[PDB]
RNA sequence: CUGCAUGGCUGUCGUCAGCUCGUGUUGUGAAAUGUUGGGUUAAGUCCCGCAACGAGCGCAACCCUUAUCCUUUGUUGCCAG
C-alpha cells in the first residue's frame, strides 16, 4: 500500500554499486530488489517538479521501448508537453540553434 | 627585354572525385570531427545510419545533337502519284 511495485527478481550479474543496497535477505544466492521507497521518494521530487511548473518550465519526455515510445505522446496530453519517441541527432538539445534549420525544413516540406 | 613587377588568359597532376565553411564536440594546443563507417556508382553519386545538421567550388541536369515515327514548305533540285 506504501508503493512498492513489481519484482521477480531480475538480473543476477554485474549490479550497479549504488543499487546493490536495495537487495533484501530472503534466500541463499537469490537476487531480489526492495521497492518500498518508490512513491515516498517520488512525493518529494514531484514537489520540485511543481516548483519548475510554477516557474513555467518547458517539460521534455523521452522513450524508445514499446511501453514508453507510444505513451510520451498520449499519456500526458492533458497538459502542453514535448517528446522524443525513436530517432536522435548529434547535439539533439545541446546545439538547438543549428537543429532549428531541420524544423524550418520540416515545415517547408 | 622578361611572367619573384603585373592585370589577364590557357595548359597539366585532373572530367579526377577531390578542397573548403557556419554552429556543436574533442585536446594545453597546431588541428581532428563533419568529408569517415555500411551498401551502391560514372561520381564527396544516391541510399542507410552515427556527434552531427546544413552549406560553398567541383559534381549533375537543364542545353545540343543522334537511332524510329508523325506533320508543315518544295526550285533551276527531286520524281513516288
Swiss-Prot record:
Write down which residues bear the modification named N6-succinyllysine. 107
Q: Which cysteines are joined by disulfide bonds?
A: none
The organism's superkingdom is given as Bacteria
Q: How does it assemble?
A: Part of the 30S ribosomal subunit, contacts bS1. Some nascent polypeptide chains are able to cross-link to this protein in situ. In collided ribosomes contacts ribosome rescue factor SmrB.
The protein's role, per its UniProt record: Required for ribosomal protein bS1 (rpsA) to bind to the 30S subunit.
**UniProt family annotation:** Belongs to the universal ribosomal protein uS2 family.
- Protein name in UniProt: Small ribosomal subunit protein uS2
In which organism is this protein found? Escherichia coli (strain K12)
Source organism phylogeny: Bacteria, Pseudomonadati, Pseudomonadota, Gammaproteobacteria, Enterobacterales
Q: Which residues of the full protein are shown?
A: 9 to 117 of 241
Amino acid at each position: 500500500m506504501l508503493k512498492a511495485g513489481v519484482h521477480f527478481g531480475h538480473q543476477t550479474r554485474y549490479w550497479n554499486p549504488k543499487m546493490k543496497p536495495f537487495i533484501f535477505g530472503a534466500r541463499n544466492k537469490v537476487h531480489i530488489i526492495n521497492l518500498e521507497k518508490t512513491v515516498p521518494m517520488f512525493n518529494e521530487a514531484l514537489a520540485e517538479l511543481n516548483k519548475i511548473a510554477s516557474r513555467k518550465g518547458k517539460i521534455l519526455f523521452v522513450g524508445t521501448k514499446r511501453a514508453a515510445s507510444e505513451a510520451v505522446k498520449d499519456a500526458a496530453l492533458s497538459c502542453d508537453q514535448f517528446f522524443v519517441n525513436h530517432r536522435w541527432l548529434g547535439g539533439m538539445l545541446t546545439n538547438w540553434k543549428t537543429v532549428r534549420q531541420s524544423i524550418k525544413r520540416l515545415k517547408d516540406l
